[PDB]
Scaffold this active site. Structure first.
Site, PDB file in Angstrom:
ATOM      1  N   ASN A  28      -6.016   1.712   0.239  1.00  0.00           N
ATOM      2  CA  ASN A  28      -6.644   2.365  -0.908  1.00  0.00           C
ATOM      3  C   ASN A  28      -6.408   1.600  -2.203  1.00  0.00           C
ATOM      4  O   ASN A  28      -5.548   0.728  -2.274  1.00  0.00           O
ATOM      5  CB  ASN A  28      -6.155   3.791  -1.023  1.00  0.00           C
ATOM      6  CG  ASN A  28      -6.617   4.637   0.148  1.00  0.00           C
ATOM      7  OD1 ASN A  28      -6.943   4.111   1.220  1.00  0.00           O
ATOM      8  ND2 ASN A  28      -6.623   5.938  -0.035  1.00  0.00           N
TER       9      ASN A  28
ATOM     10  N   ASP B 103      -4.170   3.999   4.490  1.00  0.00           N
ATOM     11  CA  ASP B 103      -4.564   4.908   5.555  1.00  0.00           C
ATOM     12  C   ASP B 103      -4.297   4.180   6.899  1.00  0.00           C
ATOM     13  O   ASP B 103      -4.730   3.063   7.103  1.00  0.00           O
ATOM     14  CB  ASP B 103      -6.039   5.260   5.465  1.00  0.00           C
ATOM     15  CG  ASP B 103      -6.434   5.904   4.155  1.00  0.00           C
ATOM     16  OD1 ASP B 103      -5.624   6.534   3.430  1.00  0.00           O
ATOM     17  OD2 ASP B 103      -7.637   5.767   3.859  1.00  0.00           O
TER      18      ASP B 103
ATOM     19  N   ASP C 211      -5.192   2.471  -4.936  1.00  0.00           N
ATOM     20  CA  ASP C 211      -3.945   2.836  -5.591  1.00  0.00           C
ATOM     21  C   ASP C 211      -2.675   2.281  -4.921  1.00  0.00           C
ATOM     22  O   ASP C 211      -1.560   2.633  -5.312  1.00  0.00           O
ATOM     23  CB  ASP C 211      -3.878   4.359  -5.701  1.00  0.00           C
ATOM     24  CG  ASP C 211      -3.871   5.051  -4.341  1.00  0.00           C
ATOM     25  OD1 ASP C 211      -3.801   4.345  -3.321  1.00  0.00           O
ATOM     26  OD2 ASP C 211      -3.958   6.309  -4.294  1.00  0.00           O
TER      27      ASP C 211
ATOM     28  N   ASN D 290      -2.937   8.886   5.343  1.00  0.00           N
ATOM     29  CA  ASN D 290      -2.552   8.178   4.118  1.00  0.00           C
ATOM     30  C   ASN D 290      -1.060   8.245   3.806  1.00  0.00           C
ATOM     31  O   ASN D 290      -0.441   9.282   3.941  1.00  0.00           O
ATOM     32  CB  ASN D 290      -3.339   8.728   2.918  1.00  0.00           C
ATOM     33  CG  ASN D 290      -3.092   7.924   1.642  1.00  0.00           C
ATOM     34  OD1 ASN D 290      -2.270   8.299   0.829  1.00  0.00           O
ATOM     35  ND2 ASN D 290      -3.764   6.838   1.488  1.00  0.00           N
TER      36      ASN D 290
ATOM     37  N   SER E 199      -1.800   2.764  -1.784  1.00  0.00           N
ATOM     38  CA  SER E 199      -1.507   3.523  -0.583  1.00  0.00           C
ATOM     39  C   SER E 199      -2.400   3.008   0.532  1.00  0.00           C
ATOM     40  O   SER E 199      -3.343   2.255   0.299  1.00  0.00           O
ATOM     41  CB  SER E 199      -1.726   5.011  -0.782  1.00  0.00           C
ATOM     42  OG  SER E 199      -3.091   5.330  -0.959  1.00  0.00           O
TER      43      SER E 199
ATOM     44  N   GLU F  33     -13.473   7.405  11.236  1.00  0.00           N
ATOM     45  CA  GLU F  33     -12.323   6.909  10.468  1.00  0.00           C
ATOM     46  C   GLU F  33     -11.864   5.564  11.002  1.00  0.00           C
ATOM     47  O   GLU F  33     -11.544   4.703  10.219  1.00  0.00           O
ATOM     48  CB  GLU F  33     -11.137   7.882  10.487  1.00  0.00           C
ATOM     49  CG  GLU F  33     -11.367   9.204   9.766  1.00  0.00           C
ATOM     50  CD  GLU F  33     -11.335   9.080   8.238  1.00  0.00           C
ATOM     51  OE1 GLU F  33     -10.991   8.008   7.721  1.00  0.00           O
ATOM     52  OE2 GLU F  33     -11.727  10.038   7.574  1.00  0.00           O
TER      53      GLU F  33
END
EC number: 3.2.1.17
Length: 129
Positions: free
Chosen positions: A46, A52, A48, A59, A50, A35
């Site tokens: 992301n 992480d 959208d 997230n 958002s 990750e």
């Protein structure tokens, strides 16, 4: 902060990730490697809007408040910036809530793709824990 492998493993162990919800420590170290490459300051936007955050790429849609994601709900009751600290406590406390949310570690796409089904013992090889 960028952790060493066994360095991270020990901190995760301290906070009781070893075997947490039936996932041995190597799963978590593997998750962190893929990750974030063990970097607490990792962030990935992301599509959208958002983001992480941190060593386990948690997230903002559901888990932390950044003031700039749709819907904000903040189930871990933390600012997302806390997930970026050199100390992994916020990330670990929140992870424990995420992994109990009905999909186990499948909530981490990098774990799902690079760790699940593998000999995760490799990730804690050479550690004195």
């Amino acid at each position: 902060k960028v952790f060493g492998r066994c360095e991270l493993a020990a901190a995760m162990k301290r906070h009781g990730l070893d075997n947490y919800r039936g996932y041995s420590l190597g799963n978590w170290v593997c998750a962190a490697k893929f990750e974030s490459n063990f970097n607490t300051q990792a962030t990935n936007r992301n599509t959208d809007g958002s983001t992480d955050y941190g060593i386990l790429q948690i997230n903002s849609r559901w888990w932390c408040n950044d003031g700039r994601t749709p819907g904000s709900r903040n189930l871990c009751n933390i600012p997302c910036s806390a997930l970026l600290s050199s100390d992994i406590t916020a990330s670990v406390n929140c992870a424990k809530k995420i992994v109990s949310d009905g999909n186990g570690m499948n909530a981490w796409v990098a774990w799902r793709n690079r760790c699940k089904g593998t000999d995760v013992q490799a990730w804690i090889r050479g550690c004195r824990l």
